Amino acid sequence: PLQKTYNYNVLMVPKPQGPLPNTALLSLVLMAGTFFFAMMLRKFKNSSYFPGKLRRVIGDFGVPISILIMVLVDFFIQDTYTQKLSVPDGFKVSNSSARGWVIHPLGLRSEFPIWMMFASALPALLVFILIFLESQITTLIVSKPERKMVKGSGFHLDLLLVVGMGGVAALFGMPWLSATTVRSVTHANALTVMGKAQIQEVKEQRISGLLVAVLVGLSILMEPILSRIPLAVLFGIFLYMGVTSLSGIQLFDRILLLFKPPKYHPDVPYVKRVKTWRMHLFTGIQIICLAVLWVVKSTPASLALPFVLILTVPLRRVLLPLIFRNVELQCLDADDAKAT
């Protein structure tokens, strides 16, 4: 906290045991600076300044350039403390006395009961619904027709790979993962080539994700490099990804249209072929659904979020035609953004 007086002889291991001067304000400055530089380089990519190819290059490396600039800024301020990235010391289990690299299904210290061998299906059921919904919805979002992906997306191979790898990793005392939405959307956006406002193509390849995974694995040995990277720069980066992931969402556009006058409204089929108040009723129902899901996520019963999210499919398929015409639903809920 910001206070008139501070203790100057505070212990610095393993983390602040008390308040420190200039820490929160410098974190705010670093986060704002990296977000501002990322947005400025994003606008520079679409700007008309410099040789266009150099601007396109500089703009492609906009996030690394901002990260480097703010990392140097924190580097040259030596007296102030900022929390830095911390990686494990080595490739060892996080607790040596509890388990090894391989887990015996019959038990480590005590015999595993027979009834739980069969009762593990229900938590496995819940994990499967969670991972299935997250991964397949992420695949649907990333591989939309308007994103200009011509190489195809597989909804059966990826689910099998992700869930089987998670099930195998469980045997090694490792977490089961999922295809996250924000990271995948950012990855697809960073490989998207813009035309001369309109999506032109995406560099769909296997090398970028492979190199990211390899670098994540190698991060333990990159401690002298990662130990000088503050978390505030990464927070500004996260804010950039969060505000960037809203570009292709029509719900966000319609929420903006709520604050935007109808005459301004763009030339899109759900504006030109649907009444403005009907469109705003559609947006308000979606907003009510968002509020319900946020409330559910705020309770301890947040693992029921996949089921409440599933409940929005009977909504659109049954209750929405009871108040909206087929034309209105085709214009608003369009698979490939078509005017019916």
Partner: protein, 40 residues
């Protein structure tokens, strides 16, 4: 593993092989059941 662990009759490869075998068996059972239906 690590530290002091209970010694079972089956080692980790043996127990995971028998579990994979049981899983393959039940998978084949469900597949053969589904092949029996939708035909008769």
């Amino acid at each position: 593993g690590e530290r002091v662990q209970l010694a079972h009759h089956f080692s980790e490869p043996e127990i995971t092989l028998i579990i994979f075998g049981v899983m393959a068996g039940v998978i084949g059972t469900i597949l053969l059941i589904s092949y029996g239906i939708r035909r008769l």
